[PDB]
């Protein structure tokens, strides 16, 4: 009963957050086994930020002046292997709270929970999605850098996101944990295109399959359409093309619900050209597209 | 940058969740020091649920047949003091993870995070509010009972909510941790009025003060009104009266922002009669009222 934007419990990650300081900039790190992960630009001294030289700093910079803190427990630094845009510090102590964990790259449309931190301490958790343009609509301030996004797969923490920067439109770009940016972004202060964002067609459908479940079923209509026609409706309405995979994934829902994906497709396109008239689906006057088919199911079976 | 519905980190509570079984019903408990808290109707055997006798069960029921589990660690039961609608079991072991913690009653309009659990294990966290009618719009299924709502005050966990039941409209009622229901609700299967819910005027204002901050400022208008006139606008639009306290709390925002509360009041009432034309404030086509003035500030200063 009810249907909410809902993040994974943050406990298993909370135990991995630490502070990382270097001169003028302190930001967050992730303490996994005997290594700690942070955005490499922890070594930038502003100035550098206009167009930096992360080769001609990394090796030229020394362990000692990297102040790692695990609350107070000032972790004893060792290594400094740089992977892309992450800086990985091996440390004398290994994490006793280290959860069963994993580094993963997510595709656009997938969601994760974000645990937003400052000075190595968490302030809160929210769920967002990798946008088609490879941005995320998150909530970050000064010091949020190194904050991480994650899924939990039973007792297993899949880490997908580390936060690096804000983009023109108050949206956010960051890397995976092997330090490669989502989207064509660099850690530098240049004019970077956000990109024109599509709506995640499948996620909006899965949302309506969550509605009908939770009794709200008014939007429903007396028509149907084709996977082709639909798509060309999508296009003027900046909806990602819908694909056979997308259909085959909306099955397990469309199944239980009765309603076949292609009716919901018409039920949807009706809403797209018509307006919403100021009525609301699951307490929203807008089409929500940050819920994966999967997201729905876990919030309808623990 | 950005603005999200955001829950407190769940770590400190996760360590307090346990399973509580009695015959046909297993649900969640809260393990604080050497006592564990759960909804008293863990002892109901259906049937009872039509109109129960929690006097003529509590004492008549025996410790041993209460199966408390802390993961596997089958906690050794002792006590059975019943406070209102909670059943409090003292146990041989005290919680080493017991956080600095506190039992508190929240007023309508205030928010808390919910950590929704099944079989004593958490599935996710979301933020919701005590609705004026004393309901909450949450996301709960079978086994969610005993799930708790909370705020965190630095290292201090204020517990406000324990979940008991669903109401007509797919909304939720539950107690404080001293076992007294929010609203006029009872743990029994009778026809219970949800109640007609107002919109939390102050929270909707604090939301707009969060908008302007995060650059979205279009809604803004060329007028003003009075605290009186406004209120009588509120009334047809089911907005709670606005009060001097409500004003004095929107200060610290209205301050930093420049804009004085009474302009935003006109800026608001314009939106109320006019429609939203299908444009959006902070990625919402509806007036959001589950953000306290406080909620905004912490998400603009860690
Ligand atoms: C990180 O938090 C960070 O790298 N800085 C940590 C810090 C900052 C102040 C004091 C102590 C520690 C931020 C993300 C923050 C910034 C404001 N809101 C956030 O979400 N990342 C950056 O500052 C980032 C660094 C880049 C090398 C990778 N960055 C630098 C310069 C300019 C921008 N963006 C910006 O203002 O441009 C737009 C596109 C107009 C928004 C930037 O993100
Ligand atoms: C709790 O989870 C619970 O008490 N039951 C735990 C349980 C259930 C099945 C198997 C194992 C353990 C639920 C809350 C759940 C129920 C479905 N969605 C939820 O949020 N609470 C109740 O079941 C509650 C117990 C009352 C004594 C306090 N309860 C009982 C009967 C009827 C209702 N509500 C209902 O269906 O009525 C409405 C108003 C039409 C919705 C109820 O909530």
């Amino acid at each position: 009963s009810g249907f909410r934007k809902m993040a994974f419990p943050s406990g298993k990650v909370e135990g991995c957050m630490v502070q990382v300081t270097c001169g003028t900039t302190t930001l967050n790190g992730l303490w996994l086994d005997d290594v700690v992960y942070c955005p490499r630009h922890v070594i930038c001294t502003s100035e550098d930020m206009l167009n930096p030289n992360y080769e001609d700093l990394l090796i030229r910079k020394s362990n000692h002046n990297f102040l790692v803190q695990a609350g107070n427990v000032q972790l004893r630094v060792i290594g400094h292997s740089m992977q892309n845009c992450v800086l990985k510090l091996k440390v004398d102590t290994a994490n006793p709270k280290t959860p069963k964990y994993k580094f993963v790259r997510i595709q656009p449309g997938q969601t994760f929970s974000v645990l937003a931190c400052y000075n190595g301490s968490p302030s809160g958790v929210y769920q967002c999605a990798m946008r088609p343009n490879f941005t995320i609509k998150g909530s970050f301030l000064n010091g949020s850098c190194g904050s991480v996004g994650f899924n939990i797969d039973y007792d297993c923490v899949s880490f997908c996101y580390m936060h690096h920067m804000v983009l023109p439109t108050g949206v956010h770009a960051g890397t995976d944990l092997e330090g490669n940016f989502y989207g064509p972004f660099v850690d530098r202060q240049t004019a970077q295109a956000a990109g024109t964002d599509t709506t995640i067609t499948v996620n909006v459908l899965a949302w309506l399959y969550a509605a009908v479940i939770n009794g709200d079923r008014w939007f429903l209509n007396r028509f149907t359409t084709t996977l082709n026609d639909f798509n060309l409706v999508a296009m003027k309405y900046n909806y990602e093309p819908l694909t056979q995979d997308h259909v085959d994934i909306l099955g397990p829902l469309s199944a239980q619900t009765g309603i076949a994906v292609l009716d919901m497709c018409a039920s949807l396109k009706e809403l797209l050209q018509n307006g919403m008239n100021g009525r609301t689906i699951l307490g929203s006057a807008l089409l929500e597209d940050e819920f994966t088919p999967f997201d729905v199911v876990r919030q309808c079976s623990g």
Side-chain angles (χ1 to χ4, degrees), chain A residues 24-27 39 41 44 49 54 118 139-146 163-172 181 186-190 192:
Chain A
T24 183
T25 329
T26 187
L27 39 58
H41 73 274
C44 281
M49 211 92 78
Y54 298 100
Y118 305 86
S139 164
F140 292 128
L141 299 167
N142 284 234
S144 79
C145 277
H163 180 63
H164 282 230
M165 61 191 220
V166 182
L167 271 162
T169 18
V171 298
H172 303 87
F181 262 93
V186 291
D187 38 344
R188 154 192 169 182
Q189 190 162 19
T190 165
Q192 303 213 40

Side-chain angles (χ1 to χ4, degrees), chain A residues 204-222:
Chain A
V204 147
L205 280 167
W207 184 54
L208 296 161
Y209 285 144
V212 302
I213 280 165
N214 311 309
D216 195 290
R217 298 167 299 103
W218 63 269
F219 58 100
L220 287 178
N221 80 338
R222 211 163 305 184

Side-chain angles (χ1 to χ4, degrees), chain A residues 271-284:
Chain A
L271 292 150
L272 297 187
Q273 28 181 47
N274 189 284
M276 211 177 292
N277 310 348
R279 200 41 172 116
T280 85
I281 308 88
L282 277 168
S284 153

Side-chain angles (χ1 to χ4, degrees), chain A residues 64-81:
Chain A
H64 59 263
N65 84 234
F66 287 147
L67 306 326
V68 180
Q69 205 149 207
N72 320 285
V73 190
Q74 271 269 136
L75 271 172
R76 198 160 272 284
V77 184
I78 298 179
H80 40 106
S81 24

Side-chain angles (χ1 to χ4, degrees), chain A residues 215-279:
Chain A
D216 195 290
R217 298 167 299 103
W218 63 269
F219 58 100
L220 287 178
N221 80 338
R222 211 163 305 184
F223 305 75
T224 288
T225 193
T226 79
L227 186 46
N228 289 37
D229 171 5
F230 173 84
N231 289 320
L232 216 306
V233 195
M235 286 215 316
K236 64 217 50 156
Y237 281 121
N238 256 323
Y239 275 56
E240 292 285 280
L242 192 67
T243 68
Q244 194 49 81
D245 300 20
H246 294 334
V247 165
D248 293 357
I249 295 158
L250 290 171
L253 294 194
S254 178
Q256 176 194 338
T257 55
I259 291 179
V261 180
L262 277 207
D263 219 86
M264 197 54 86
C265 290
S267 322
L268 176 34
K269 83 93 54 149
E270 216 319 280
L271 292 150
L272 297 187
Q273 28 181 47
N274 189 284
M276 211 177 292
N277 310 348
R279 200 41 172 116

Side-chain angles (χ1 to χ4, degrees), chain A residues 120-185:
Chain A
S121 53
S123 54
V125 99
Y126 51 96
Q127 187 96 147
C128 44
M130 194 54 50
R131 296 309 317 183
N133 63 10
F134 289 100
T135 69
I136 78 175
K137 313 158 108 78
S139 164
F140 292 128
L141 299 167
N142 284 234
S144 79
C145 277
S147 287
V148 310
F150 61 111
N151 287 292
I152 299 181
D153 167 61
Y154 169 35
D155 92 336
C156 184
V157 183
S158 324
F159 288 104
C160 45
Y161 185 72
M162 193 182 281
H163 180 63
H164 282 230
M165 61 191 220
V166 182
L167 271 162
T169 18
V171 298
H172 303 87
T175 61
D176 57 10
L177 272 295
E178 315 192 342
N180 299 105
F181 262 93
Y182 292 104
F185 304 131

Side-chain angles (χ1 to χ4, degrees), chain A residues 10-67:
Chain A
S10 56
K12 269 185 172 71
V13 172
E14 276 163 78
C16 304
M17 300 321 289
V18 313
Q19 188 190 39
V20 198
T21 309
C22 181
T24 183
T25 329
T26 187
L27 39 58
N28 297 288
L30 183 87
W31 181 40
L32 297 193
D33 297 309
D34 47 324
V35 248
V36 166
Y37 302 85
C38 102
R40 68 170 171 179
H41 73 274
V42 63
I43 77 194
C44 281
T45 57
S46 295
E47 158 214 342
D48 310 340
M49 211 92 78
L50 277 306
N51 184 15
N53 225 294
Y54 298 100
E55 292 68 15
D56 294 7
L57 286 173
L58 171 69
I59 52 101
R60 330 218 314 188
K61 190 162 272 269
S62 275
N63 308 334
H64 59 263
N65 84 234
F66 287 147
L67 306 326

